Enzyme design. Structure first.
Site, PDB file in Angstrom:
ATOM      1  N   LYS A  26      -9.300   5.120   4.135  1.00  0.00           N
ATOM      2  CA  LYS A  26      -7.441   5.395   4.325  1.00  0.00           C
ATOM      3  C   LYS A  26      -7.202   3.722   4.041  1.00  0.00           C
ATOM      4  O   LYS A  26      -7.459   3.131   3.184  1.00  0.00           O
ATOM      5  CB  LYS A  26      -7.086   6.081   5.597  1.00  0.00           C
ATOM      6  CG  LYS A  26      -7.787   7.709   5.522  1.00  0.00           C
ATOM      7  CD  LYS A  26      -7.172   8.178   6.656  1.00  0.00           C
ATOM      8  CE  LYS A  26      -7.837   7.575   7.883  1.00  0.00           C
ATOM      9  NZ  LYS A  26      -9.055   8.557   7.938  1.00  0.00           N
ATOM     10  N   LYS A  27      -6.281   3.404   5.245  1.00  0.00           N
ATOM     11  CA  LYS A  27      -5.385   2.484   5.088  1.00  0.00           C
ATOM     12  C   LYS A  27      -6.105   0.713   5.208  1.00  0.00           C
ATOM     13  O   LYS A  27      -6.019  -0.225   4.114  1.00  0.00           O
ATOM     14  CB  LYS A  27      -3.779   2.522   5.638  1.00  0.00           C
ATOM     15  CG  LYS A  27      -3.082   0.931   5.455  1.00  0.00           C
ATOM     16  CD  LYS A  27      -2.443   0.548   6.731  1.00  0.00           C
ATOM     17  CE  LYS A  27      -1.171  -0.326   6.411  1.00  0.00           C
ATOM     18  NZ  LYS A  27      -2.203  -1.659   6.817  1.00  0.00           N
ATOM     19  N   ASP A  86      -4.509  -2.227  13.718  1.00  0.00           N
ATOM     20  CA  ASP A  86      -4.025  -3.423  13.155  1.00  0.00           C
ATOM     21  C   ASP A  86      -4.410  -4.407  15.142  1.00  0.00           C
ATOM     22  O   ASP A  86      -4.333  -4.995  14.586  1.00  0.00           O
ATOM     23  CB  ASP A  86      -2.935  -3.801  13.429  1.00  0.00           C
ATOM     24  CG  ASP A  86      -2.344  -2.337  14.097  1.00  0.00           C
ATOM     25  OD1 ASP A  86      -2.402  -1.626  15.004  1.00  0.00           O
ATOM     26  OD2 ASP A  86      -0.750  -2.429  13.994  1.00  0.00           O
ATOM     27  N   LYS A 109       5.883  11.458  -0.550  1.00  0.00           N
ATOM     28  CA  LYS A 109       6.091  11.680   0.302  1.00  0.00           C
ATOM     29  C   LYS A 109       7.115  10.561   0.385  1.00  0.00           C
ATOM     30  O   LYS A 109       8.452  10.066   0.951  1.00  0.00           O
ATOM     31  CB  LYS A 109       5.459  11.511   1.755  1.00  0.00           C
ATOM     32  CG  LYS A 109       4.188  12.808   2.127  1.00  0.00           C
ATOM     33  CD  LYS A 109       4.922  14.024   1.328  1.00  0.00           C
ATOM     34  CE  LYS A 109       3.911  14.926   1.722  1.00  0.00           C
ATOM     35  NZ  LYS A 109       5.229  16.112   0.725  1.00  0.00           N
ATOM     36  N   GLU A 110       6.506   9.565  -0.132  1.00  0.00           N
ATOM     37  CA  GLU A 110       7.663   7.497  -0.177  1.00  0.00           C
ATOM     38  C   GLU A 110       7.831   7.771  -1.243  1.00  0.00           C
ATOM     39  O   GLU A 110       7.524   7.259  -2.961  1.00  0.00           O
ATOM     40  CB  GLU A 110       6.516   6.885  -0.579  1.00  0.00           C
ATOM     41  CG  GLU A 110       5.424   6.941   0.716  1.00  0.00           C
ATOM     42  CD  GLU A 110       4.329   6.423   1.012  1.00  0.00           C
ATOM     43  OE1 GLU A 110       4.255   5.425  -0.144  1.00  0.00           O
ATOM     44  OE2 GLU A 110       3.144   5.969   2.069  1.00  0.00           O
ATOM     45  N   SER A 162       0.826  -1.377  -0.032  1.00  0.00           N
ATOM     46  CA  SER A 162       0.072  -0.771  -0.677  1.00  0.00           C
ATOM     47  C   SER A 162       0.672   1.231  -0.102  1.00  0.00           C
ATOM     48  O   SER A 162       1.671   1.647   0.592  1.00  0.00           O
ATOM     49  CB  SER A 162      -0.590  -0.237   1.305  1.00  0.00           C
ATOM     50  OG  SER A 162      -0.058   0.009   2.473  1.00  0.00           O
ATOM     51  N   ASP A 176       4.189  -3.570   4.494  1.00  0.00           N
ATOM     52  CA  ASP A 176       4.726  -2.390   4.065  1.00  0.00           C
ATOM     53  C   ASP A 176       5.367  -1.716   3.388  1.00  0.00           C
ATOM     54  O   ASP A 176       6.308  -2.602   1.974  1.00  0.00           O
ATOM     55  CB  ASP A 176       5.432  -1.302   4.652  1.00  0.00           C
ATOM     56  CG  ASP A 176       3.896  -1.403   6.038  1.00  0.00           C
ATOM     57  OD1 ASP A 176       2.405  -1.195   5.405  1.00  0.00           O
ATOM     58  OD2 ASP A 176       3.880  -0.660   7.288  1.00  0.00           O
ATOM     59  N   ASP A 198      -3.416   5.350  -3.013  1.00  0.00           N
ATOM     60  CA  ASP A 198      -4.101   5.775  -2.687  1.00  0.00           C
ATOM     61  C   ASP A 198      -3.897   7.704  -3.460  1.00  0.00           C
ATOM     62  O   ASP A 198      -5.608   7.625  -3.793  1.00  0.00           O
ATOM     63  CB  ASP A 198      -4.376   6.013  -0.976  1.00  0.00           C
ATOM     64  CG  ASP A 198      -5.087   5.203  -0.097  1.00  0.00           C
ATOM     65  OD1 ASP A 198      -5.661   4.330  -1.334  1.00  0.00           O
ATOM     66  OD2 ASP A 198      -5.310   5.531   0.861  1.00  0.00           O
TER      67      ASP A 198
END
Lengths: 724, 134, 95
Positions: free
Chosen positions: A284-285, A464, A113-114, A107, A309, A143
């Protein structure tokens, strides 16, 4: 048969020579703790009654927290797996592979940012896993719906063609090119193939060119064009608007497609972007994971789901086989909800100044959890079972009903009934992309149980923990696989700000779970959940609440140094003996904790430092936000979190200076208990030393506004304490 | 002669720093923020060329360690005017710039001038200040 | 010389570790006896501790390895050392 009767795995209880003293002195330290409280309660201080009451409340809270932490660690175990037996049973040479299918989920939210290079490395590591190419699939969720991720995945799929055969031929570990080519270990060790050097040079040059291409792609996509984004064939990019775009599904490799350098096939890579519309909550996630689960069930329908991740790469290529050693067992595999792997990180300092390694938790608490019902699902690197995610009970321990629970997609309902995975036979292969697009519609999760009883659970930032607790309350069991070589490795936070923000987020999620209807204290009373697991869940839920006793205790000595009172009525032989016995018991218990857990002194010492820092800094604001949400509806580097610790530190320094001046320079004579009075402040400043080191040292920096606020608050507090 | 290869490479690939010794001895990832498709091959070629240049400079230093019996001689048979450090006429030489010779891209390079002021016995040269004035 | 018998080898570390923990225990006991209880004219304790420091200064690597990382010893040798140290301390106290 003898071969079939041999278990695929076995448990290793901690040997009695190291576990009997642990329990013995646990009970013993309980006894001295009770005697210490009996001594403290019955003998108050006449002239400092308020300070004595506050102190006794603080140690009562500390003892309750210690009891709740120590109780789950009664029976720690280890687990050992045998891959050779798995090969004999399911992966016999010559015969077709009988291993079950696998889906690995990644994801990402923002390519800015990533960086796309890390995601490409993770995808390359996943595609190079030691598993049959037809039994493994990879799904990537975006996303942000950015074309940069699409192009990066399209280039990674073309680099995989050359990278995967090289790794599979030469047994390259790790499979991520960036970490493999940046290793200082001798790369010629244990290599026997005669063509290793030339192929390694060629693949290194190819990887460098791939990195340059990725850099060019990132640079080109930095600025959005005037007429929006466009693809390479002239069609416009559907995801031009981040908050308004239809669902997109693309397949890059796998069956048909195109072969690699050796002529074989590669694991299927799927790019999925769920539909986003204004006025709809995407969760979101958790929502992304639910959409990925539905899509994977529609297309491939693997019976096991791997959660990885974006910044975590598969370090050990045998991780899937180790997971199948537990999950494919005829007896245990039915009652297992997920398999959890430890979290390891790279690029950390040798001293681990921020305690990013986190050895204490993952090597003590996780092992203690594994000995009762199973580790709590945290972070990434988890192998889930689909039946657990569907809200079904453990096997070994009504169409309208299905439409009310899963959704209005009959293909998904049919796929949910496959025990061993795979596409159901009574399903047209041509009409599969349309249904996969349908299951990611914004309105699909309407009048269904998604996010409430099945899949990832909404309502909390740390979904989680909630998902793991909801699986455990059903009666499922979990294992804690700890391979010799770590299965997954990620990236640790760089500076203190990111770690503080992450701790604050965790504490906020814990508080939200505490105030919700899913609290372990009053939820799950069905009998499936074990008592010790419930106590562990409660401990993990109400842990940030221990901030208030901490922040008072750290402020206790300075007030004593600014008022002239002590929490002890009079130093006596009996009281000194009790204090020394308690300190010796605590130190010894910590010593055997290191002995049985295999943790060095430095790691646990800095872990304690970071625990105190976190409790003083992030948990306080977490509780403040929780109280504000309870009593109102207001909400918020973030230059406010460092105000309490710095203020308390300089309060302690000022109090030390004032007490030294008052009781030595002027008074002298019989100073009295000033030795322990200063020792307590030394302990407090030692536990909060990193803040002072950062403020006064290099490689850091604090704005003047927060420093001025802290100084003003400290001066006001000191003046009020002196006046009163 | 090495400049004619080094300068166009740096100008094309925005190499920082421009000194080869400090650029090739940097521990920072040299592939960061590079978008040109031909960076790797040209960088390898220029690194090998710089290593050969360093070897040539080492050979020149080794050869000039010991002064010959009849003084220094140039590469065309003429003797070196600066045989005596304290007694030699002024020398001015131009290596690059206008006319001269172009680089590997066909463009010219900044002018490089070698200047050695006249030195005679009994005259104070004032060392660095006099050299700067000259 | 006197017989015909002969032998990580977990016996060589028994003397140094036992002696180190004996020195630590003796330091603690002397500090408790001559400062916490007695005090007054403690006397030559400043030397008595200092000499012991010398020993613990010279045998520091054994303690660093036992308590630190990149090392480790089995429980059997530690148990033997602790038992021998306790026996020696009890015999010295009794006599």
């Amino acid at each position: 048969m003898d071969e079939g009767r041999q278990p695929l795995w076995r448990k290793l209880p901690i040997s009695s020579s190291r576990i009997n003293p642990y329990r013995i002195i646990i009970v013993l330290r309980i006894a001295i703790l009770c005697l210490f409280f009996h001594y403290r309660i019955l003998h108050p201080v006449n002239d400092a009654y308020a300070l004595w009451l506050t102190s006794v409340i603080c140690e009562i809270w500390f003892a309750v927290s210690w009891i709740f932490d120590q109780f789950p660690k009664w029976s720690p175990i280890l687990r050992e797996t045998y891959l050779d037996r798995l090969s004999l049973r399911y992966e016999k040479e010559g015969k077709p592979s009988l291993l079950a299918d696998i889906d690995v989920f990644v994801s990402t939210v923002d390519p800015m940012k990533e960086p796309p290079l890390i995601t490409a490395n993770t995808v390359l590591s996943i595609l190079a896993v030691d598993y049959p190419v037809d039994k493994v699939a990879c799904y990537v969720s975006d996303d942000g719906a950015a074309m940069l991720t699409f192009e990066a995945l399209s280039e990674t799929s073309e680099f995989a063609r050359k990278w995967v055969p090289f790794c599979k031929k030469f047994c390259i570990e790790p499979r991520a090119p960036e970490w493999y080519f940046a290793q200082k270990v001798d790369y010629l060790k244990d290599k026997v193939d005669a063509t290793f050097i030339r192929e390694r040079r060629a693949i290194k040059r190819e990887y460098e060119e791939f990195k340059v291409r990725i850099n060019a792609l990132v640079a080109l996509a930095q600025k959005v064009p005037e007429d929006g984004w466009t693809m390479q064939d002239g069609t416009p990019w559907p995801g031009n608007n981040v908050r308004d775009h239809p669902g997109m599904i693309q397949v890059f490799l796998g069956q048909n497609g195109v072969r690699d350098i050796e002529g074989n096939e590669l694991p299927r890579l799927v790019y999925v972007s769920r539909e986003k519309r204004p006025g709809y909550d995407h969760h979101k996630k958790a929502g992304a994971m639910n959409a990925l689960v539905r899509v994977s069930a529609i297309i491939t329908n693997a019976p096991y789901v791997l959660n990885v991740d974006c910044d975590h790469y598969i370090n050990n290529s045998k991780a899937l086989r180790e997971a199948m050693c537990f999950m494919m067992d005829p007896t245990s595999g039915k009652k297992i909800c997920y398999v959890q792997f430890p979290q390891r990180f790279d690029g950390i300092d040798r001293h681990d100044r921020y305690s990013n390694r986190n050895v204490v938790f993952f090597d003590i608490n996780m092992k203690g959890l594994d000995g009762i019902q199973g580790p709590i699902y945290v972070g990434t690197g988890c192998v889930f079972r689909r039946q657990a995610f569907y809200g079904y009970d453990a096997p070994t321990s009504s169409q309208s009903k299905f439409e009310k629970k899963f959704g209005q997609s009959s293909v998904f309902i049919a796929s949910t009934l496959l025990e061993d995975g795979g596409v159901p036979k009574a399903a047209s292969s041509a009409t599969l992309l349309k249904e996969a697009i349908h299951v990611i519609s914004c309105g699909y999760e309407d009048k269904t149980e998604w996010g409430k009883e099945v899949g990832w659970i909404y309502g909390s930032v740390t979904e989680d923990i909630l998902t793991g607790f909801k699986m455990h309350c059903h009666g499922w069991r979990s294992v804690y696989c700890m391979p010799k070589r770590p299965a997954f490795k990620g990236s640790a936070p760089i500076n203190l700000s990111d770690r503080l923000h992450q701790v604050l987020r965790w504490a906020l999620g814990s508080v939200e779970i505490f105030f919700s209807r899913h609290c372990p204290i009053w939820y799950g009373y069905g009998g499936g959940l074990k008592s010790l697991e419930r106590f562990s869940y409660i401990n993990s839920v109400v842990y940030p609440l221990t901030s208030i006793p901490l922040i008072a205790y750290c402020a206790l000595p300075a007030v004593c140094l600014l008022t002239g009172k002590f929490i002890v009525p009079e130093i006596s032989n009996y009281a000194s003996i009790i204090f020394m016995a308690l300190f010796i018991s605590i130190a010894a218990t910590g010593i055997l904790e290191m002995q049985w857990g295999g943790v060095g002194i430095h790691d646990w010492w800095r872990n304690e430092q970071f625990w105190v820092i976190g409790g003083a800094s992030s948990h306080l604001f977490a509780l403040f936000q929780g109280l504000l949400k309870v009593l109102a509806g207001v909400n918020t580097k973030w230059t406010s979190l460092l105000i309490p610790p710095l203020t308390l530190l300089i309060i302690n320094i000022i109090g030390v200076i004032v007490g030294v001046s008052d009781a030595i320079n002027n008074g002298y004579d019989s100073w009295g208990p000033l030795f322990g009075r200063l020792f307590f402040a030394l302990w407090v400043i030692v536990h909060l030393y990193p803040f002072l080191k950062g403020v006064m040292g290099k490689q850091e920096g604090v704005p003047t506004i927060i420093l001025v606020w802290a100084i003003l608050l400290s001066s006001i507090l000191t003046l009020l304490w002196v006046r009163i």
